[PDB]
């Protein structure tokens, strides 16, 4: 879980759409960017990486 | 012309192509840009699987068209 | 979870995925039924194949149980309708949707994979006697996906 904490987490600008929940980013959301340049919701990528270790898009390991 | 190739996950790549390019040539350029061997690629456009040896003009693929890539 | 499923349903309503349709059965949003048109190149051309889609409560973090309810003569599909597909097991990703899974299934119908088969008998027939495979597959399609 601390591996999840040691990740590029930043504040919210751009809207786009998180590929997991398919939802537009809004204020209050905190984004998390992976080394593979892919950015997601903190909530979504945290619930994903809790049981897997791959990026949801390009499947590069983290 | 330039085309888009989107994976199922959402990986969007932009390809420089000729309408006379075969599907195998497009797979070779996909390997050049992303590094996946062509034998593992399956290209689809307009819900139709693209055959190796067919050209882009066979399928009426035009500017800013979007193919879908399936891995294996 | 639920809102993800509703978003996928609305996106299917806006963008019909060509030779594929899908949607809930009754008032249960977690049990979907889908129809896939046989690829025009394939021996499954002209047929309509039904599928059941069971979503887990932790979707999209777990892949759904997608099974063929229409009988089909395919090396990667057994009599229980189970599909030996990469993204329905080890290669699942929460960025995938039902539309993309149906695209994958249509691609599998067009281009089978006999080297990693689910029904080894059909794989042997496919890689050794292609005439018999195509014949039995076409008559299976006409007997279980046409007429009515
Ligand atoms: Zn999200
Ligand atoms: Zn990635």
Swiss-Prot record, chain A:
Annotated zinc fingers (RING-type), start-end: 18-59
Disease: Tonne-Kalscheuer syndrome: An X-linked recessive disorder characterized by global developmental delay apparent from early infancy, impaired intellectual development, speech delay, behavioral abnormalities, abnormal gait, dysmorphic facial features, limb anomalies, and urogenital abnormalities with hypogenitalism. A subset of more severely affected males develop congenital diaphragmatic hernia in utero, which may result in perinatal or premature death. Carrier females may have very mild skeletal or hormonal abnormalities.
Subcellular location: Nucleus
Tissues where this protein is expressed: Expressed in many tissues.
Organism listed in the record: Homo sapiens
Annotated family: Belongs to the RNF12 family.
Primary role: E3 ubiquitin-protein ligase. Acts as a negative coregulator for LIM homeodomain transcription factors by mediating the ubiquitination and subsequent degradation of LIM cofactors LDB1 and LDB2 and by mediating the recruitment the SIN3a/histone deacetylase corepressor complex. Ubiquitination and degradation of LIM cofactors LDB1 and LDB2 allows DNA-bound LIM homeodomain transcription factors to interact with other protein partners such as RLIM. Plays a role in telomere length-mediated growth suppression by mediating the ubiquitination and degradation of TERF1.
Subunit structure: Interacts with LIM/homeobox factors such as LHX3. Interacts with LDB1, LDB2 and SIN3A. Interacts with LIMK1. Interacts (via N-terminus) with TERF1. Interacts (via C-terminus) with ESR1.
Miscellaneous comment: Acts as a positive coregulator of ESR1-mediated transcription in breast cancer cells.
Name the UniProt record assigns to this protein: E3 ubiquitin-protein ligase RLIM
Lineage, top ranks: Eukaryota, Metazoa, Chordata, Craniata, Vertebrata
From Swiss-Prot, chain B:
Membrane topology, from the record: Peripheral membrane protein
Name used for this protein in its record: Ubiquitin
Subcellular location: Cytoplasm; Nucleus; Mitochondrion outer membrane
Phosphoserine: residues carrying this PTM: 65
Record annotation: effect of changing residue 72 to A: Impairs ubiquitination by CRL2(KLHDC3) E3 ligase complex. Impairs ubiquitination by CRL2(KLHDC3) E3 ligase complex
Positions bearing the site annotation: Essential for function: 68
Span within the parent record: 1 to 72 of 685
Main function: Exists either covalently attached to another protein, or free (unanchored). When covalently bound, it is conjugated to target proteins via an isopeptide bond either as a monomer (monoubiquitin), a polymer linked via different Lys residues of the ubiquitin (polyubiquitin chains) or a linear polymer linked via the initiator Met of the ubiquitin (linear polyubiquitin chains).
Post-translational modification comment from the UniProt entry: Phosphorylated at Ser-65 by PINK1 during mitophagy. Phosphorylated ubiquitin specifically binds and activates parkin (PRKN), triggering mitophagy. Phosphorylation does not affect E1-mediated E2 charging of ubiquitin but affects discharging of E2 enzymes to form polyubiquitin chains. It also affects deubiquitination by deubiquitinase enzymes such as USP30.
Top-level taxon of origin: Eukaryota
Residue intervals of the Ubiquitin-like domain: 1-72
The species this protein was found in: Homo sapiens
Impact noted for substituting residue 44 to D: Impairs ubiquitination by CRL2(KLHDC3) E3 ligase complex. Impairs ubiquitination by CRL2(KLHDC3) E3 ligase complex
Sites marked Interacts with activating enzyme: 54, 72
Consequence of changing residue 72 to G: No effect on ADP-ribosylation
Record-listed cross-link Glycyl lysine isopeptide (Lys-Gly) (interchain with G-Cter in ubiquitin), residues: 6, 11, 27, 29, 33, 48, 63
Effect the entry attributes to changing residue 48 to R: No effect on HLTF-mediated polyubiquitination of PCNA. Impairs ubiquitination by CRL2(KLHDC3) E3 ligase complex
Residues that bear (Microbial infection) ADP-ribosylthreonine: 66
Curated annotation (Swiss-Prot), chain C:
Entry's Gene Ontology BP terms: protein autoubiquitination; protein K48-linked ubiquitination; protein modification process; protein polyubiquitination; protein ubiquitination; ubiquitin-dependent protein catabolic process
EC number: 2.3.2.23, 2.3.2.24
PROSITE patterns the UniProt entry points to: UBC_1 (PS00183), UBC_2 (PS50127)
Catalytic activity from the UniProt record: S-ubiquitinyl-[E1 ubiquitin-activating enzyme]-L-cysteine + [E2 ubiquitin-conjugating enzyme]-L-cysteine = [E1 ubiquitin-activating enzyme]-L-cysteine + S-ubiquitinyl-[E2 ubiquitin-conjugating enzyme]-L-cysteine; S-ubiquitinyl-[E1 ubiquitin-activating enzyme]-L-cysteine + [acceptor protein]-L-lysine = [E1 ubiquitin-activating enzyme]-L-cysteine + N(6)-monoubiquitinyl-[acceptor protein]-L-lysine
UniProt GO cellular component terms: cytosol; extracellular exosome; nucleoplasm; nucleus; protein-containing complex
Residues annotated as domain UBC core: 1-146
Broadest EC class assigned to this enzyme: transferase
InterPro entries, A to Z: UBQ-conjugat_E2_core, UBQ-conjugating_AS, UBQ-conjugating_enzyme/RWD
The keyword Transport appears for this protein: no
GO molecular function: ATP binding; ubiquitin conjugating enzyme activity; ubiquitin protein ligase activity; ubiquitin-protein transferase activity
Pfam families hit by this protein: UQ_con (PF00179)
Record keywords, A-Z: ATP-binding, Nucleotide-binding, Transferase, Ubl conjugation pathway
Domain of life assignment: Eukaryota
Positions annotated as active site in the UniProt record: 84 (glycyl thioester intermediate)
Pathway field: Protein modification; protein ubiquitination
Family listed: Belongs to the ubiquitin-conjugating enzyme family.
Assembly and oligomerization: Interacts with SCF (SKP1-CUL1-F-box protein) E3 ubiquitin ligase complex. Interacts with CNOT4 (via RING domain). Interacts with E3 ubiquitin-protein ligases CBLC, PJA1 and PJA2. Interacts with PDZRN3. Interacts with PPP1R11. Interacts with E3 ubiquitin-protein ligase PHF7; the interaction inhibits cleavage of PHF7 and promotes association of the complex with the nucleosome core particle.
Protein name: Ubiquitin-conjugating enzyme E2 D2
